């Protein structure tokens, strides 16, 4: 049946420019092509029909092009909103079948994430465990690493961390790194430090926090 | 209004079956198709099947082993896809979408996520995340909720009913132990808050229970 | 009025019916077969007009049995009523003629 | 005429798994695949016509797929009586021809 080629199935461009995402066909399909835009954690929304056709309350920024085997959807000044995966899907034969997706990404200014600690909460120290939360928000690029030392000493044991995908508000990445430890070892301990290494910065972003 | 409404999870046991709902509103025709689409996490979307409501009969992907089996309620205007004899292969979330009868979707449900475990349902606990005494305050102040304990995905974290929508961020959860764990953080202006309230919504769709969680300063 | 002119009529509504019906089931029938191009019902409609007037360019044609046989019964439906239509111009053509005389 | 090019030409796969053996066509054949089993000193056996039909006394495990110039044969669940060659044959266009055969190992 019908193989649809997205590639690359990753596009980076800056803020404003030119975004052109490209379908293959395996054969000749008229205009029997659709676009559809997936948002993180969204479902799949249509924003062009029949290879060129606009949609309503689809933004006129967006537009598509290209007819037999080779399609395009463009987007003419990219912006934030606009980060997302991508999906052609064909109707000419059956089955109907997708593209395998082009994520659209966006290279903006280098930004310094915003550091906050968070001690455990009352509610659940009761319930017999501490987590001390620590929040990376708004940095790009989105690599960066994060130390936790308690009482000056590097911890490593129960820190599970957590990373967004690029941020369709302004295009930065965030991250979020927990440490869990029971009420009791949370007790014999008094400073609990959070560190950020990051590209826009020799030194280090610390929080820390004494119980 | 919402054309295609879909239940939010469904928990199943390996070797069990499930049959998973879309309920359509709106204009309906004697031409639209509902078909059933699969996407793994990370990866894209898989066609499985059809239905024509109006006559009954419904077409499969043939590629793939068939677990599906839809039908279509004509008085409830609901199709339903029956999937059985599961596998954590078949995890994901099933999406149905409904087509004129002129090949694109023009409109898809939220999807109903499916999770294939021996595990056991559990509401997740929800916990305040307000500065500490010395976190000193700029111009903005960031809050946030810790959900925990839970199982299985997903939760919908909310901040004052959706009212507050920028400055939001949800990360994704991580599995340890059966279950999971997710923080949401929100950023207001630093002089608006306590002086107006910030709260927390976090349902859990795979046992019915939403709650809600004030964020609110520490002694 | 004259029989002639109401079976006409009579074929051309019940014709509009088969290329309807016939765009219905052409679909209900492709679909499902590894592909089948009859697929979606505004070009099916075309396929059923173009079927009935014979013209069959194809652009597009059944691939499945239950398609043939919903093509075969719009081919017969626009033959006869295309037929009947000559027919009844015939008659008509007969009667004012033997009166010009 | 029609070449039906089968590749792999042996297929390695552990016990109980999923396998699909492939057969690609020099040129566009619609759905006139057929698929044939033949075991060691055996005569050839019809597994599925027309690419994607079930025959009657065949394991359900069997099923095919595929249009235009690309099959697959696939075996959900593999056992040891599968263990043998596999044939597609096509009946588009004067004179049938067969591919060249794929070994299922396990
Ligand atoms: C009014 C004349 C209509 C003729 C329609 C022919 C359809 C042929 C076909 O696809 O038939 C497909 C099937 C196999 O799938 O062949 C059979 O065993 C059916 C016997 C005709
Ligand atoms: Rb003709
Ligand atoms: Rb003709
Ligand atoms: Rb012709
Ligand atoms: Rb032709
Ligand atoms: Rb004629």
């Given at each position: 049946?019908?193989?649809?080629?997205?590639?690359?199935?990753?596009?980076?461009?800056?803020?404003?420019?030119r975004?052109?995402?490209?379908?293959?066909?395996?054969?000749?399909?008229?205009?029997?092509?659709?676009?559809?835009?997936?948002?993180?954690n969204?479902?799949?929304?249509?924003?062009?029909?029949?290879?060129?056709?606009?949609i309503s309350?689809?933004?006129?920024?967006?537009?598509?092009?290209?007819?037999?085997?080779?399609?395009?959807?463009?987007?003419?000044?990219?912006?934030?909103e606009?980060?997302?995966?991508?999906?052609?899907?064909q109707?000419?034969?059956?089955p109907?079948?997708?593209g395998?997706?082009?994520?659209?990404?966006?290279?903006?200014?280098?930004?310094?994430?915003?550091?906050?600690?968070?001690p455990?909460?009352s509610?659940?120290?009761?319930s017999?465990?501490?987590?001390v939360?620590?929040?990376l928000?708004?940095?790009?690029?989105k690599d960066i690493?994060?130390?936790?030392?308690?009482?000056?000493?590097?911890?490593?044991?129960?820190?599970?961390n957590?990373?967004?995908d690029?941020?369709?508000k302004?295009?930065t990445?965030?991250?979020?790194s927990?440490?869990?430890?029971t009420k009791?070892?949370?007790?014999?301990h008094?400073?609990?430090?959070?560190?950020?290494?990051?590209k826009?910065?020799?030194?280090?972003?610390?929080?820390?926090?004494?119980? | 209004?919402?054309?295609?409404?879909?239940?939010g999870?469904?928990?199943?046991?390996?070797?069990?079956?499930?049959?998973?709902?879309?309920?359509?509103?709106?204009?309906?025709?004697?031409?639209?198709?509902?078909?059933?689409?699969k996407?793994?996490?990370?990866?894209g979307?898989?066609?499985?099947?059809?239905?024509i409501?109006?006559?009954?009969?419904?077409?499969?992907?043939?590629?793939i082993?068939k677990?599906?089996?839809?039908?279509?309620?004509?008085?409830?205007?609901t199709?339903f896809?029956?999937?059985?004899?599961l596998?954590?292969?078949?995890?994901?979330?099933?999406?149905?979408?409904?087509?004129?009868?002129?090949?694109?979707?023009?409109?898809?449900?939220?999807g109903?996520?499916?999770?294939?475990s021996?595990?056991?349902?559990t509401?997740?606990?929800?916990?305040?995340?307000?500065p500490?005494?010395?976190?000193?305050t700029?111009?903005?102040?960031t809050?946030?909720?810790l959900?925990?304990g839970?199982?299985?995905?997903?939760?919908?974290?909310?901040?004052?009913?959706?009212?507050?929508?920028?400055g939001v961020?949800?990360?994704?959860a991580?599995?340890?132990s059966?279950?999971?764990?997710?923080?949401?953080?929100?950023?207001?202006?630093?002089?608006?808050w306590?002086?107006?309230?910030?709260?927390?919504?976090?349902?859990?769709?795979?046992?019915?229970?939403?709650?809600?969680?004030?964020?609110?300063?520490?002694? | 009025?004259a029989?002639?002119?109401?079976?006409?009529?009579?074929?051309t509504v019940?014709?509009?019916?088969?290329?309807?019906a016939?765009?219905?089931?052409?679909?209900?029938?492709?679909?499902?077969?590894?592909?089948?191009?009859?697929i979606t019902?505004?070009?099916?409609?075309?396929?059923?007009?173009?079927?009935?007037?014979?013209?069959?360019?194809?652009?597009?044609?059944?691939?499945?049995?239950?398609?043939?046989?919903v093509?075969?019964?719009?081919?017969?439906?626009?033959?006869?009523?295309?037929?009947?239509?000559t027919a009844?111009?015939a008659?008509?053509?007969?009667?004012?003629?033997?009166?010009?005389?």
């Amino acid at each position: 049946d019908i193989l649809l080629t997205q590639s690359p199935a990753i596009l980076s461009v800056s803020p404003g420019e030119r975004v052109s995402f490209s379908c293959r066909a395996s054969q000749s399909i008229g205009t029997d092509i659709h676009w559809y835009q997936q948002r993180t954690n969204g479902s799949p929304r249509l924003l062009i029909k029949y290879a060129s056709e606009s949609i309503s309350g689809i933004p006129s920024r967006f537009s598509g092009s290209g007819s037999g085997t080779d399609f395009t959807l463009s987007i003419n000044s990219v912006e934030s909103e606009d980060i997302a995966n991508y999906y052609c899907q064909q109707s000419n034969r059956w089955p109907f079948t997708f593209g395998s997706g082009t994520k659209l990404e966006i290279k903006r200014a280098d930004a310094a994430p915003t550091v906050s600690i968070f001690p455990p909460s009352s509610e659940q120290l009761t319930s017999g465990g501490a987590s001390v939360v620590c929040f990376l928000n708004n940095f790009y690029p989105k690599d960066i690493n994060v130390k936790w030392k308690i009482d000056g000493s590097e911890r490593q044991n129960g820190v599970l961390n957590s990373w967004t995908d690029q941020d369709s508000k302004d295009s930065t990445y965030s991250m979020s790194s927990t440490l869990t430890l029971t009420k009791d070892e949370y007790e014999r301990h008094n400073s609990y430090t959070c560190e950020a290494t990051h590209k826009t910065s020799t030194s280090p972003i610390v929080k820390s926090f004494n119980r | 209004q919402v054309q295609l409404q879909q239940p939010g999870a469904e928990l199943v046991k390996p070797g069990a079956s499930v049959k998973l709902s879309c309920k359509a509103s709106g204009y309906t025709f004697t031409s639209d198709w509902i078909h059933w689409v699969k996407q793994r996490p990370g990866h894209g979307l898989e066609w499985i099947g059809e239905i024509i409501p109006s006559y009954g009969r419904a077409n499969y992907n043939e590629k793939i082993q068939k677990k599906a089996t839809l039908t279509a309620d004509k008085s409830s205007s609901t199709a339903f896809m029956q999937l059985s004899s599961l596998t954590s292969e078949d995890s994901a979330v099933y999406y149905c979408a409904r087509e004129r009868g002129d090949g694109y979707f023009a409109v898809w449900g939220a999807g109903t996520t499916v999770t294939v475990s021996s595990a056991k349902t559990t509401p997740p606990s929800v916990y305040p995340l307000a500065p500490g005494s010395a976190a000193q305050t700029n111009s903005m102040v960031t809050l946030g909720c810790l959900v925990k304990g839970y199982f299985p995905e997903p939760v919908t974290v909310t901040w004052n009913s959706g009212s507050l929508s920028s400055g939001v961020h949800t990360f994704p959860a991580v599995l340890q132990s059966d279950l999971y764990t997710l923080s949401s953080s929100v950023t207001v202006p630093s002089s608006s808050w306590p002086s107006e309230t910030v709260t927390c919504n976090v349902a859990h769709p795979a046992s019915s229970t939403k709650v809600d969680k004030k964020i609110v300063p520490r002694d | 009025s004259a029989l002639h002119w109401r079976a006409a009529g009579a074929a051309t509504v019940l014709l509009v019916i088969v290329l309807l019906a016939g765009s219905y089931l052409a679909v209900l029938a492709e679909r499902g077969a590894p592909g089948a191009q009859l697929i979606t019902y505004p070009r099916a409609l075309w396929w059923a007009c173009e079927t009935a007037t014979t013209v069959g360019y194809x652009d597009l044609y059944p691939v499945t049995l239950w398609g043939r046989l919903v093509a075969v019964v719009v081919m017969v439906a626009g033959i006869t009523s295309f037929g009947l239509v000559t027919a009844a111009l015939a008659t008509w053509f007969v009667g004012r003629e033997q009166e010009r005389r």
